Amino acid sequence: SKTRYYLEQCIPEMDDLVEKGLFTKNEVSLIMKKRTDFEHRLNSRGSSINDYIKYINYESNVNKLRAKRCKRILQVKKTNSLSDWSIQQRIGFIYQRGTNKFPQDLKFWAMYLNYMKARGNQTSYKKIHNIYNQLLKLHPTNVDIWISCAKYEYEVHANFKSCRNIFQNGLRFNPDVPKLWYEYVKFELNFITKLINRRKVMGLINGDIALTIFDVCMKTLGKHYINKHKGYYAISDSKMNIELNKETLNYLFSESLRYIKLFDEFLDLERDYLINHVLQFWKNDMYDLSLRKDLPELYLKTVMIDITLNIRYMPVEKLDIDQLQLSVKKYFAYISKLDSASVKSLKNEYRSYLQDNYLKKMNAEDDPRYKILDLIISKL
Amino acid sequence: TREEFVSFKAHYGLVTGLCVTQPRFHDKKPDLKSQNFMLSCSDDKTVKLWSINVDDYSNKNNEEGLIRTFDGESAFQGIDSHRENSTFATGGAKIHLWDVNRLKPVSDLSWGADNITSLKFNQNETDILASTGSDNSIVLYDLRTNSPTQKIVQTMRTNAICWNPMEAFNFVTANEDHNAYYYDMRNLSRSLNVFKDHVSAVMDVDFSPTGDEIVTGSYDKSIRIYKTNHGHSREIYHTKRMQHVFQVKYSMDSKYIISGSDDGNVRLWRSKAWERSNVKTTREKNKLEYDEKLKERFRHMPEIKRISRHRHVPQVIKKAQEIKNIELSSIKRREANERRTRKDMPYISERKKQIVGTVHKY
Amino acid sequence: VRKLKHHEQKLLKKVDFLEWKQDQGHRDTQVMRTYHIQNREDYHKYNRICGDIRRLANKLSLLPPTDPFRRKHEQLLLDKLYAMGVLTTKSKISDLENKVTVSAICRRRLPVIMHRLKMAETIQDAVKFIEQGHVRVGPNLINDPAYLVTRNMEDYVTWVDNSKIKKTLLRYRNQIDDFDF
RNA sequence: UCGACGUACUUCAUAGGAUCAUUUCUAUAGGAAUCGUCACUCUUUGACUCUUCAAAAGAGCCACUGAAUCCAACUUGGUUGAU
RNA sequence: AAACUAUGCCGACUAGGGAUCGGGUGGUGUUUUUUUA
RNA sequence: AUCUGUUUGGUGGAACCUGAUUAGAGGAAACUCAAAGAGUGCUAUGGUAUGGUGACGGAGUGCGCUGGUCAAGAGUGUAAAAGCUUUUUGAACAGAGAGCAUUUCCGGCAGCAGAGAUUUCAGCUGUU
Ligand SMILES: [Mg+2]
């Protein structure tokens, strides 16, 4: 049987434990009896992943118990013999057998990866790559795996070359997931901020790339969203097709707004320049729908970001009157082209923005600018 | 599938030789994946190169038929092709070396005026060639020198030669004295082994690609398989419908034997009768593996010998063995009587009996 | 045993855990069932008597055919066996071998003769009535179901006077006379 | 009454092929079987209890201690309706 | 006087085994024997 | 109807004959106990069994191996070419974990500071 072969592989380890004096023969017998039940459990029918989890948990405690008797009895940190790595080798083997038997369980894969990453010295990083290669092939459509190895090789390794290739391959399999685009762009700018800081660090001691990802993201996400909500067929009625166009604009708009929030985090990059690219993107008519005509509510938000763009990142201390005038000059420009209902709502939002960010944070009696802000707010 | 890819009426006379080759023209790479080529020679004094469409791969989607013809002054009797290079050799009144891209023999090899009956290129030291003559001789050649090397004259003609796929310097010979002889290239005075089970002339011989077994076709309507380390067959294959075994071959997996007789049928046989072609579960594999070692350990027991060696051979072969056994006993009894009184009658080993002489003495 | 596979059957041709050659085909059990013999060794006690008859006949046959001694003894044996009821016919001397069998002797047992006289519906029923003391032969009650009845004594097989079975016979035909009982 | 002749009448052969029979092999290579079990469904047979056709015999007598049924009696429901 | 219980497929046809009769060749060592033949 | 007596359906099953069976033929109950047959279900998966006996593993180096680009050589072809084959060689590039050696370092001990939830890992300095 398979069990007898695996039990006999434990014998050289147990001969070592008795020989070193850490475990008595009676104690060694008790460990084998417990191991015998597990190995029979794994090699039989009806086995579940919990059996593998239980056996791995048991082996870990045996490793701990041997470790403490090693310091208590032998009084040595490491006894150069088979007993040291026999348990660790075994636990890895249980992980391999369980993963092959039950590839569907993603939790077990995570435990396997955490276990092998934890003992970095014992396990070469090359072995970690093999686990990810086999896992990725089985589940190409789980983005969390793709980001995990990308994150692992950006933090533990910091190989942007391999990490970039992971995002390149991951998006190839899952172009319809906004989440993977969000992380790849986050990685892309993360590579830039780290790079510029190195240049800044270099000086003392002596963004478009993300936008392209954003642009292709918005096109690709649109195509798949249209394919979904249509089923096997196209939609014959014209009105329904218009609605499907409206949904993707809103769905794509929410994605674009989510990227807008991401840019704010990055002080080093020229966020105003990066945001303006997004605003320019939405100016172009898309899917035969105009934002100003068909989706005004999205348009007002599009206008509002443009109005505050020059003053969005200006602290109250460095508030320049001329730049505020440019914002107000932009404010009057859009009103001349907007309807009354839109102007009122747009007026309310802009007034609240100025009041909350600048007026409420400024002392009234110390700064002449406070009077100017109130006059503008009153006139707005 | 046991079906034909193509059938060609290649020659007006008898097809005296055939080999499957992978040509390399100087200027053109033939599509080896989609086409396979075979060379045929006949007593009408011509050698023809053919092309056959095959369905090994589906990477494509013709030119199926005769490609090139070589004319010769005399009839041909045996053909074989060099494995590494494109050169191939034909054996007729003179053994000729040909190149696929030349219409005439590039080089002429011959020990003398005697004709050559067969030839077979070496499989590992691909530059070496061996041939069989009608004067009961075996001539060894080397293309690196473009000359013959060694010659030994035996008591009877040898019909076929095969080289050991795993031992570059060893080859077995099918002989007309009811025997097959295993020879070492470097020392041809003595044979390595002799296989004696057949009762008629052995007409063809072939090595298993593992190199640990040989199969011999005989004029007695039987096929016998020998272990290279033993001088007696472990098996005999026969059928009432098989009429004269003239060719025997091993499948490249060593699992099957292909035999061609003069009744016009090409049969397939298992190398080991009791084995089966299905993939075995681990429990099956170990039990069968366990049995084989268990059989080898007790092979010397009387009862196990009785059953293991028992085969039903045709009546004609059985009577031949009985008459053959009586004759050898009389000869052995008789030489024993002569040795009692004869002062000088030497002992000659069975391995050295068949050699009449060698050209280059050492 | 489970049904043997093909390769097992060829290697275990003679294996049989329920039939052996020494059983002689379970002839004893078959004859015991037919006539409801309750003692396991009754058949083989009968078999020895049959063999004694057959042995004597074989020796008699080897005497010369015209011998007065041979003819006398062979007729005497035929005379005696017919009287017991073992042999149905006296004509043929070969009957001493061919038609002398344990079934012939068992067929003269009291339960079987009751069945043939229709005193019981089955041999098993006849055995029960004998064990229950309903059957007499002549004036003697017999509770032994192995009693052999000769041809002459088959006339005296009958029910006991006070048997409840007799009352049912007479009551069914409305011919019961309680003076007798 | 037996013979001979004549007439009439009854009976008698033989083949081809395959399979099963040797604890492998019935003589043929033209053919098909070598695995240490865990469950579920169905089907056949046999036991144990009881029982019909359908009866028959009770290892037998006393004492104590439990149980079941059917009446009597009592208690509940019941013509504003039991069965 | 004689026969009187037998019998074997046949042939243009292969390779043999043991024993024996006549001749011849070779080997060997026991009988044999020696310049009378 | 102290009319008539055929048919249909139920009840009953003498005699003869034919067939099958025979320690007579049956029936009811089950989270009962046995002996067998057939089918079905289940990753039912070592083609030669974990990366590892300090007999070791990790890091590095070199060799080995892979992919195509370029250059050169050889063959073929031509007026000269272009073109095609190459188990001919070299360069740089991009690599796989998939082999071989390598003591060059680490994995004993103390201290510095960090990442993660008293425990795990990573870096540096002294020491055997
Ligand atoms: Mg017949």
From Swiss-Prot, chain A:
One of its GO terms (biological process) is maturation of SSU-rRNA from tricistronic rRNA transcript (SSU-rRNA, 5.8S rRNA, LSU-rRNA). GO terms for cellular component: 90S preribosome; nucleolus; nucleoplasm; Pwp2p-containing subcomplex of 90S preribosome; small-subunit processome. Its main location: nucleus. HAT repeats lie at residues 86-118, 123-155, 158-190. The keyword Transcription does not apply. Keywords: Nucleus, Repeat, Ribonucleoprotein, Ribosome biogenesis, rRNA processing. One of its GO terms (molecular function) is U3 snoRNA binding. InterPro entries: HAT, TPR-like_helical_dom_sf, Utp6, UTP6_N. It is found in: Nucleus, Nucleolus. Present with 7520 molecules/cell in log phase SD medium. Belongs to the UTP6 family. Component of the ribosomal small subunit (SSU) processome, or 90S pre-ribosomal particle, composed of the 35S pre-rRNA precursor, the U3 snoRNA, and at least 40 protein subunits. Component of the PWP2/UTP-B subcomplex composed of DIP2, PWP2, UTP6, UTP13, UTP18 and UTP21. Interacts with U3 snoRNA. Interacts with MPP10. Component of the SSU processome, a pre-ribosomal particle required for the maturation of the 18S rRNA from the 35S pre-rRNA precursor. This is U3 small nucleolar RNA-associated protein 6.
From Swiss-Prot, chain B:
It comes from Saccharomyces cerevisiae (strain ATCC 204508 / S288c) (Baker's yeast). Disulfide bonds: none annotated. This is Protein SOF1. Belongs to the WD repeat DCAF13/WDSOF1 family. Required for ribosomal RNA processing. Keywords: Nucleus, Repeat, Ribonucleoprotein, Ribosome biogenesis, rRNA processing, WD repeat. It is found in: Nucleus, Nucleolus. One of its GO terms (molecular function) is mRNA binding. Present with 6620 molecules/cell in log phase SD medium. Residues 334-353 have a biased composition (Basic and acidic residues). GO terms for cellular component: 90S preribosome; nucleolus; nucleoplasm; small-subunit processome. WD repeats lie at residues 15-60, 71-108, 111-151, 153-193, 197-236, 240-279. GO terms for biological process: maturation of SSU-rRNA; maturation of SSU-rRNA from tricistronic rRNA transcript (SSU-rRNA, 5.8S rRNA, LSU-rRNA). Interacts with snoRNA U3. Interacts with NOP1 and MPP10. Component of the ribosomal small subunit (SSU) processome composed of at least 40 protein subunits and snoRNA U3.
Swiss-Prot record, chain C:
One of its GO terms (cellular component) is small-subunit processome. It is found in: Nucleus, Nucleolus. Its main location: nucleus. Keywords: Nucleus, Ribonucleoprotein, Ribosome biogenesis, RNA-binding, rRNA processing, rRNA-binding. Gene3D superfamilies: RNA-binding S4 domain (3.10.290.10). GO terms for biological process: maturation of SSU-rRNA; ribosomal small subunit biogenesis; rRNA processing. InterPro entries: Ribosomal_uS4 (IPR022801), Ribosomal_uS4_N (IPR001912), S4_RNA-bd (IPR002942), S4_RNA-bd_sf (IPR036986). Pfam families: Ribosomal_S4, S4. One of its GO terms (molecular function) is RNA folding chaperone. Residues 108-174 form the S4 RNA-binding domain. Belongs to the universal ribosomal protein uS4 family. Required for the early cleavages at sites A0, A1 and A2 during 18S ribosomal pre-RNA processing. Component of a heterotrimeric complex containing IMP3, IMP4 and MPP10. Interacts with MPP10. Component of the ribosomal small subunit (SSU) processome composed of at least 40 protein subunits and snoRNA U3. This is U3 small nucleolar ribonucleoprotein protein IMP3.
